[PDB]
Amino acid sequence: EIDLNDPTATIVIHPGSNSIKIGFPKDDHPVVVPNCVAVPKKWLDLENSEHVENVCLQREQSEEFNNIKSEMEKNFRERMRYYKRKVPGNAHEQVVSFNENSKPEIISEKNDPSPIEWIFDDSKLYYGSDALRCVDEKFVIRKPFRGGSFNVKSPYYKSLAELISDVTKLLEHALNSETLNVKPTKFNQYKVVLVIPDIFKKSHVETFIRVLLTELQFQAVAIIQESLATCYGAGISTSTCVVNIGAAETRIACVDEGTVLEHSAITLDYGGDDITRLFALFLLQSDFPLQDWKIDSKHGWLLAERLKKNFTTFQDADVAVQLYNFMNRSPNQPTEKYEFKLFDEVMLAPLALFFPQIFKLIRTSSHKNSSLEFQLPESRDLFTNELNDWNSLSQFESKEGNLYCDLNDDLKILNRILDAHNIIDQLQDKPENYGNTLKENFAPLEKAIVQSIANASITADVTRMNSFYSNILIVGGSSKIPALDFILTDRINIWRPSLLSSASFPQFYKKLTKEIKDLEGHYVNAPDKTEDENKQILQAQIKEKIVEELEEQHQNIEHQNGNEHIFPVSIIPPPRDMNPALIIWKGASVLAQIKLVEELFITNSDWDVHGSRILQYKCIFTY
Ligand SMILES: Nc1ncnc2c1ncn2[C@@H]1O[C@H](COP(=O)(O)OP(=O)(O)O)[C@@H](O)[C@H]1O
């Protein structure tokens, strides 16, 4: 019952597309609960909405895709050369696929599971790991969450009601488990710290808080953004830049002195799933023993995910023509073992993180539910009536393909950088249906980080650029690819422009901003011409000059009569044998355990009196 602030009575929850992490803050680990709900096929209208898409794929692809994969193969040839080895390659034996029926002795292939005890009873819904053994000739699988936000676009819900009912039944499931054994009636004994994305939907967060308090009936809820948690999870003191690669999205933000820098936040619309898709496509393309591979099927997906989870690498020293194998488990058959060979497919796949247009090509365009999305309108200011979610400059820029990393000359980069505060201004109160609603962000990871970094400095405290370039956390379940930190460093260094490489840029940019201020400022009398309307351009052309004057000055200043100071690229993975997927929960559970949380719990009464308004007063970030 009673509402003290004590870590015993707290539950930490970090939702996401793949799985919901959940447990008490003192737990060495959280329970990781798959983000699924399996629904009997007969309980749903399945005609008009249609797309019985759980049964179809494509080995042959477009020209544009073959081009890109060709380009990807050359990139691979080159790296390989630049260190190691090449061969006769693709020439094969899987063209003659030989299958070996196993007895019911399936020893473990990886992680925590072994042979599959399936579920045929289609008279109830099933949750989590249980939904995963739900044979999909009787069940459909829907997923309440899309990475910390609510999965609005799914076709298998018809209203927020449905969506929330199984959000609450998924959590209850989670909360009822061997290791944390919590029934709904005892829920009101517990506070929750909830992790939320860096660019959250205010309507979603608010809804979620409203449910945790008012339906599930928890004591009090505190919220934190992913990036900040991932810092408490590790070391929070510095200014750091978090890259977070999960299944659906990859998320990048910089954090400095306790706040997530808004204009650094990027959400790339690709992640581990896309790799899993690309990789299976790639094997199919190298004549893989299973040729009709129903991938958007629950059963085939689970295979594509297992292989890639086993086999993808960025480790050039381990790339060889080699002998792998897998067991294709049986909805209604005998377990069948196959044996296949592999060469480059293990790297081409993850390399698509740098050629993400390929990912767009191999998946269908979003098909969101307007009858659902209607019910969850985007939060607006109760006064002005304007979209009032956090709105990132970097996200806007990257989505639109306006990356400094794609700019050649030092002037245009500097002119845009000198322009930012205007573009962020035009952003916050534009005729702003502008800056695409529907568009997905497919910027390549390396160029994205650079943006995130560049904008986080110039829009806050420029001097921290060094700190940022030498604390890039790579976190998140999909980041467990080996040698990711290696290839990534290689690439930023290829791609980060020289102007944004000079360790003395900030000090320079800090000078240029001053001498530009000394033109609007220490000339507060109408410019030298007696009569003017355009004469702000004679000081706009003097701006343009002082730009080039210092821009040049700094380049002559750059020979330095010798050695050069230049930002590092320190990408830091967690140690081998720690789970990057779980840093975030860990961080949230660190918060849950200190003096701070106390000031940050929105209690029930809090909520009833004020509504979403308290987030203005009780919140670790400026709501
Ligand atoms: N060993 C591995 N190699 C590559 N990717 C992996 C490995 N293990 C897990 N993954 C992927 O990590 C991701 C973890 O997702 P999660 O961390 O929840 O992201 P989100 O925040 O969108 O849920 C999944 O896409 C999973 O496929």
- In order of 79, 320, 341, 383, the CA distances from 326 in angstroms are 29, 18, 11, 59
d(CA 452, CA 454): 6
E strand or H helix at 243, and its extent? strand 240-245
Please tell me if the CB atom of residue 250 comes closer than 6 angstroms to any atom of ligand 1: no
Q: Method used for this model?
A: X-ray
Instruction: Count the residues in the chain.
Output: 623
Where exactly does CATH 3.30.420.40 map onto the chain?
1-49+111-225+578-623
- Which CATH number, 3.30.2350.10, 1.10.10.60, 3.30.43.10, 3.30.420.40, labels domain 1-49+111-225+578-623? 3.30.420.40
SS3 state of residue 337: strand
Query: Would you list which residues are annotated within the binding site?
Result: 244-247
Q: What does residue 346 show for φ and ψ, rounded to 5 degrees? A: -65, -20
d(CA 449, CA 455): 10
- Quick one: which of 520, 251, 276 has its CA closest to 394? 251
Please tell me if the CB atom of residue 478 comes closer than 6 angstroms to any atom of ligand 1: yes
Query: Would you list which residues are annotated within the binding site for ATP?
Result: 244-247
Pairing of strands 191-196, 220-225: parallel
372 Cβ partners below 8 Å, 6+ apart?
152, 154, 157, 158, 159, 160, 163
Query: Of 111, 132, 309, 474, which is best to mutate to test ligand 1, by the most ligand atoms within 8 angstroms of its C-beta?
Result: 309
Please tell me if the CB atom of residue 286 comes closer than 6 angstroms to any atom of ligand 1: no
E strand or H helix at 548, and its extent? helix 540-556
CB contact at 8 A, 361 and 65: yes
| Encoded tokens for 488 | 């990534």
Atom 6, ligand 1: which residue's CA is nearest?
478
Atom 24, ligand 1: which residue's CA is nearest?
247
CB contact at 8 A, 10 and 191: yes
Pairing of strands 336-342, 322-328: antiparallel
E strand or H helix at 284, and its extent? helix 272-284
What ligand 1 atom has the least distance to the C-alpha of 350? 4
Please tell me if the CB atom of residue 147 comes closer than 6 angstroms to any atom of ligand 1: yes
- Which CATH number, 3.20.10.10, 3.90.640.10, 3.30.70.1880, 3.40.50.2020, labels domain 50-110+272-365? 3.90.640.10
d(CA 35, CA 300): 17
d(CA 198, CA 226): 6
Pairing of strands 145-146, 126-127: unpaired
Please tell me if the CB atom of residue 272 comes closer than 6 angstroms to any atom of ligand 1: yes
- In order of 96, 348, 358, the CA distances from 354 in angstroms are 33, 10, 9
Lookup result for tokens 């909520």: 607
d(CA 15, CA 32): 10
CB contact at 8 A, 419 and 393: no
CATH number of 226-271+366-577: 3.30.420.580
Q: Ligand 1 centroid to 412 CA: how many Å?
A: 38
d(CA 347, CA 146): 27
DSSP 69: H
Handedness of CA 143, 147, 150, 154 (dihedral sign): negative
Q: Reported resolution in A?
A: 3.2
Handedness of CA 483, 484, 485, 486 (dihedral sign): positive
Please tell me if the CB atom of residue 587 comes closer than 6 angstroms to any atom of ligand 1: no
d(CA 171, CA 149): 15
CB contact at 8 A, 455 and 394: yes
Please tell me if the CB atom of residue 581 comes closer than 6 angstroms to any atom of ligand 1: yes
